[PDB]
């Protein structure tokens, strides 16, 4: 009646690689960002979800139109898609131009691992 | 115009701390399965599809009452949840009489990651 247990080494790593797998292909994507320009961005919650709760507070505010989020115009592909990236990979490329207004906008998300890692010490 | 990267180590491992606790506090939960004794299971889709495709069979050939999906006969909590927990963290929690059951049930599922897991080489 006892309880043993046996496990996966690094499943964070084995469960991350299935879920950016899912992001390229956009598999049991449930959420559609749309931008100014009519371009979208399939995403998943959960995934947007253990950030930040900034994309909760847009859902409340912001029109859904389509079955698509739209979104505020200070938080276009610019910001999101390398800020989303991050949030699938632990990584954030971007260029260089871009650092202000990337840390501006997760300042203002409270994305703190985000702002964290662009602080840099 | 060069794009530059930095990145945050052991994303995995952050990333899957961040989903458990979602799990334990039945946050962001988006399927319910129900078993025969009507106790429920709340869980993410997306976790369950990472490591196996049954649920989704089991959404288009299964009951839906009350927004909660009617789970099988024979997939019931004994294997159910020590499986999902397993999902969720890498870990099987298992008692050794159940050891029989739960490798059919991951065969029975596909479930390959489990099933290399309860056959150890």
Same mark, same amino acid.
């Given at each position: 009646?006892?309880?043993?247990?046996?496990?996966?080494?690094?499943?964070?790593?084995?469960?991350?690689?299935?879920?950016?797998?899912?992001?390229?292909?956009?598999?049991?994507?449930?959420? $559609? +960002?749309? !931008?100014?320009?009519?371009?979208?961005? %399939?995403?998943? *919650?959960?995934?947007?979800?253990?950030?930040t709760?900034?994309?909760?507070?847009?859902?409340?505010?912001?029109?859904?139109?389509?079955?698509?989020?739209?979104?505020?115009?200070?938080?276009?592909?610019?910001?999101?898609?390398?800020?989303?990236?991050?949030?699938?990979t632990? $990584? +954030?490329? !971007?260029?260089?131009?871009?650092y202000? %207004?990337?840390? *501006?906008?997760?300042?203002?998300?409270?994305?703190?691992?985000?702002?964290?890692?662009?602080?840099?010490?």
């Amino acid at each position: 009646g006892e309880v043993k247990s046996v496990k996966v080494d690094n499943w964070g790593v084995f469960f991350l690689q299935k879920l950016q797998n899912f992001f390229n292909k956009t598999d049991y994507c449930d959420l $559609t +960002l749309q !931008f100014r320009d009519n371009s979208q961005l %399939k995403v998943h *919650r959960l995934v947007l979800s253990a950030c930040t709760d900034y994309f909760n507070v847009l859902e409340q505010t912001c029109e859904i139109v389509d079955d698509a989020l739209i979104m505020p115009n200070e938080f276009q592909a610019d910001v999101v898609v390398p800020i989303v990236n991050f949030m699938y990979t632990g $990584t +954030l490329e !971007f260029e260089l131009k871009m650092y202000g %207004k990337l840390l *501006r906008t997760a300042k203002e998300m409270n994305m703190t691992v985000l702002l964290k890692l662009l602080e840099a010490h």
